[PDB]
Amino acid sequence: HWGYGKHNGPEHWHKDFPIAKGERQSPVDIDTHTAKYDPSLKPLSVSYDQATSLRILNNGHSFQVTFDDSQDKAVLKGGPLDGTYRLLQFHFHWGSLDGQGSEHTVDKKKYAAELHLVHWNTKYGDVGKAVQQPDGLAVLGIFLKVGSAKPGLQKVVDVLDSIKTEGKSADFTNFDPRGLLPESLDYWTYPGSLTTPPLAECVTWIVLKEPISVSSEQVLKFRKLNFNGEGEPEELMVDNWRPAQPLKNRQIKASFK
Ligand SMILES: NS(=O)(=O)c1ccc(-n2ccn(-c3ccc(F)cc3F)c2=O)cc1
Numbered sequence: 001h002w003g004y005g006k007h008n009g010p011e012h013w014h015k016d017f018p019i020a021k022g023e024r025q026s027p028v029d030i031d032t033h034t035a036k037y038d039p040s041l042k043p044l045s046v047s048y049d050q051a052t053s054l055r056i057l058n059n060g061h062s063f064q065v066t067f068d069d070s071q072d073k074a075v076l077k078g079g080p081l082d083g084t085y086r087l088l089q090f091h092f093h094w095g096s097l098d099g100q101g102s103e104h105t106v107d108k109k110k111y112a113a114e115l116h117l118v119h120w121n122t123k124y125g126d127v128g129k130a131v132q133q134p135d136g137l138a139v140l141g142i143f144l145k146v147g148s149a150k151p152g153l154q155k156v157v158d159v160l161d162s163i164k165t166e167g168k169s170a171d172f173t174n175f176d177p178r179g180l181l182p183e184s185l186d187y188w189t190y191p192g193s194l195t196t197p198p199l200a201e202c203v204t205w206i207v208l209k210e211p212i213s214v215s216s217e218q219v220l221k222f223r224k225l226n227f228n229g230e231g232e233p234e235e236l237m238v239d240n241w242r243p244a245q246p247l248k249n250r251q252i253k254a255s256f257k
Pocket residue numbers: 116117118127128129131139193194195196197198203
């Protein structure tokens with residue numbers, strides 16, 4: 001199956017998922033001088049005070065923290081969005097080196113990692129229905145650069161050793177995703193897709209201008225995870241990012257001037 005190696009990586013995905021060559025694929029390069037300020041964009045509404053995290057999981061492509069989405073507890077609204085989006089999970093994409101790892105780029109600049117907070121539109125009832133809809137999902141993307149540590153990330157870092165290999169998971173309650181957010185909610189937004197299979201074109205992307213900073217020790221912790229399952233040849237989980245895809249007939253809008 002698909003992965004990120006020479007023989008199963010992003011250049012191969014279109015064979016199993018032909019939408020990979022579609023009209024609204026993600027990620028993209030965010031060209032900051034071509035993004036147009038839109039004063040009709042509302043401020044983004046991030047309500048995470050009642051978030052209930054459940055589990056943390058190595059799924060062989062990344063690591064994922066899953067939340068209770070059976071109620072409106074951690075929801076995303078406003079910005080470019082209509083209606084209510086519940087937080088289902090967050091995961092990251094990162095590099096083998098600090099100069100690469102993010103999926104979106106900013107004037108071709110790659111960041112060391114990128115956080116995806118994944119939300120689905122409550123009008124569609126469940127995430128499986130939502131992925132079948134052009135406005136089904138809203139993913140909040142946050143870039144990570146290497147510098148000072150992010151204290152709010154450390155509880156995540158600390159448990160990765162218990163989910164080293166694909167298929168392992170741990171109980172992971174009371175994690176507060178507000179500790180992963182930068183100061184500013186200024187954002188870029190464009191219509192796009194999941195950046196892993198099935199690459200469905202269902203996502204309103206909301207990408208924050210301001211990165212968070214993480215420490216070299218924190219990012220190294222990511223790089224010690226494995227793509228493989230245990231008892232199998234060790235392949236470090238690094239460079240699990242899709243490169244930028246053709247923008248085609250899309251305009252990226254900025255919420256800030
Ligand atoms: N890399 S990203 O654009 O943040 C991204 C990529 C893929 C997903 N993803 C993949 C499968 N699913 C999924 C989960 C539950 C379900 F019922 C159906 C799905 F397609 C999903 O949400 C979610 C987020």
